[PDB]
Amino acid sequence: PVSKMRMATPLLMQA
Amino acid sequence: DIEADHVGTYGISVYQSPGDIGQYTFEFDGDELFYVDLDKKETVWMLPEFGQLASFDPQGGLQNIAVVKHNLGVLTKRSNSTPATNEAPQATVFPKSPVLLGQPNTLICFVDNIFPPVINITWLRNSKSVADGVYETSFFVNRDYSFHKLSYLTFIPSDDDIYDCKVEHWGLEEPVLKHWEPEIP
Amino acid sequence: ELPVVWAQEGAPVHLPCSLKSPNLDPNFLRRGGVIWQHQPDRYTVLSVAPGGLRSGRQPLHPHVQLEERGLQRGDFSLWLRPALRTDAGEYHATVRLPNRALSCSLRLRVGQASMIASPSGVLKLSDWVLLNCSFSRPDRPVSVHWFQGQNRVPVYNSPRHFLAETFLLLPQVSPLDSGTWGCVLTYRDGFNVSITYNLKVL
Amino acid sequence: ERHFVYQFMGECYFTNGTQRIRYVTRYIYNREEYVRYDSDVGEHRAVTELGRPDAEYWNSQPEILERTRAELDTVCRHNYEGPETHTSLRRLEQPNVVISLSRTEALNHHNTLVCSVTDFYPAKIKVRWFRNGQEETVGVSSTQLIRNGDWTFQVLVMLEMTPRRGEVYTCHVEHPSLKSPITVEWRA
Ligand SMILES: *[C@@H]1O[C@H](CO)[C@@H](O)[C@H](O)[C@H]1NC(C)=O
Ligand SMILES: *[C@@H]1O[C@H](CO)[C@@H](O)[C@H](O)[C@H]1NC(C)=O
Ligand SMILES: *[C@@H]1O[C@H](CO)[C@@H](O)[C@H](O)[C@H]1NC(C)=O
């Protein structure tokens, strides 16, 4: 079949 | 600065406030793989053949823009920082293939040092606006944090047909258009 | 009969060549080619078509890019970022327009300008001192200017400051004379050197 | 009211394929970086004093920090050994070589033939002129690498030539996608 592409995950700083 | 065999930039989140301008794109070795549309909920590839052999989940690309929106939202209130001065872009007009009169060709307009990436790029066939065969590609990033974009245009070359590329940028004191003719050659 | 132009390493150099001064149509202007060659005392170092494509020597240029507005205001000029000490040599031009054509030519000499102090090192509480700022140019400067401090306060001849043939001397260097002292030179062609040196006084 | 710019990116650095891999992630605001993680560092640093508590805030959640370290194997190593191995790594484009010359209007007059090479990928290429079977390098001017922006590259070369009778000028080019070296010639 095919192969998916995994992305880079960002982060979330607090308020 | 740093060297390697190959580098693939997976995940390119860019947000501009106000206006809520976002963009998510994948890249590799100075070349874009594909980009995810924001509102149409789909993944657009620069080349279709690689979309036939691979698939990306567009939801993950939207979470990036959502966190970045939350990121910039906290950072704009955290600091009283001033806006970065709008850099004046520099462009270069060139054909994709060698110039052959009467043969179809793709006229490219490469513009570097685009900052901020908010700019209209149009063409003028003999000082007349032509929007046929125009491909507006997504911005790119280089290691000085400036940005560069490309625009394509199919046409039929002729001596009596002079072409140019229009630039509408914020930092420009006036719109600039570099005129190229195959008649000069 | 070619003219010669100087340059100081460490600062960009101005290498211009415009077509006289008639106001022209900018549309005709942008239809113009330029070719620059170099030969040491290089060849086709940079050549750009109206399209803007930058071609030339196999190595990349030292940030040697022409002013984008100069090419649309009737000017063809070379602007390296670092005045390379090796660039010293002959330079020729080739400007191509659909109607007329010009091809200027000149020379380039690198003049390493520096300020040499006679008492080498830090100064004592009370002692004389000499400074000589000068480029490696055979012609002598016409006017000489000096200044004291980081705010560039021009130094004039005084009962404590003495100046002649681009030399300055203070016989008793009080602790107030400490700071960055610089100079300003001049020439027949308007070459200006602003070498600055932080005077070290006890 | 005023304008501001934010940017995020993740860079996978590969060497020799999968032998030594490096994963670095940047956080850009206003064309400026303030928090960075390096696979050679193992945690989030602060490029500026702005993201100094931010870097430690992400260094205070141990579950999130390991996902980032594991992203070197899940995002970088897997995509190189997966999609790219099935897509970009197996992409080769052959260059198009053409010889032309402007500024010449008479026979036996000095000029500089132009060898134009466009639409090729990847960018690991070199070009060399050949006159009568002799590699020429004196008075040679060439464009730099021109990225076509559509999965292709282009670059042009010019050689200052003297129109000598009995002449064979060849633009010799070697490339990995070119299983054989291409030679295009030109004569008076
Ligand atoms: C681009 O065009 C739109 C409408 O056509 C305009 O509002 C915007 O200001 C333009 N961007 C510029 C001039 O940078
Ligand atoms: C001192 O400067 C003068 C002119 O400023 C210059 O001609 C001379 O070579 C310099 N050096 C000396 C006298 O040692
Ligand atoms: C010296 O060169 C020009 C021309 O004489 C002059 O206008 C300028 O003020 C001087 N250079 C600097 C950097 O001040």
Ligand SMILES: *[C@@H]1O[C@H](CO)[C@@H](O)[C@H](O)[C@H]1NC(C)=O
């Ligand atoms: C590169 O990888 C090959 C294949 O795994 C290996 O034989 C070679 O020694 C490696 N070279 C290095 C690590 O310098």
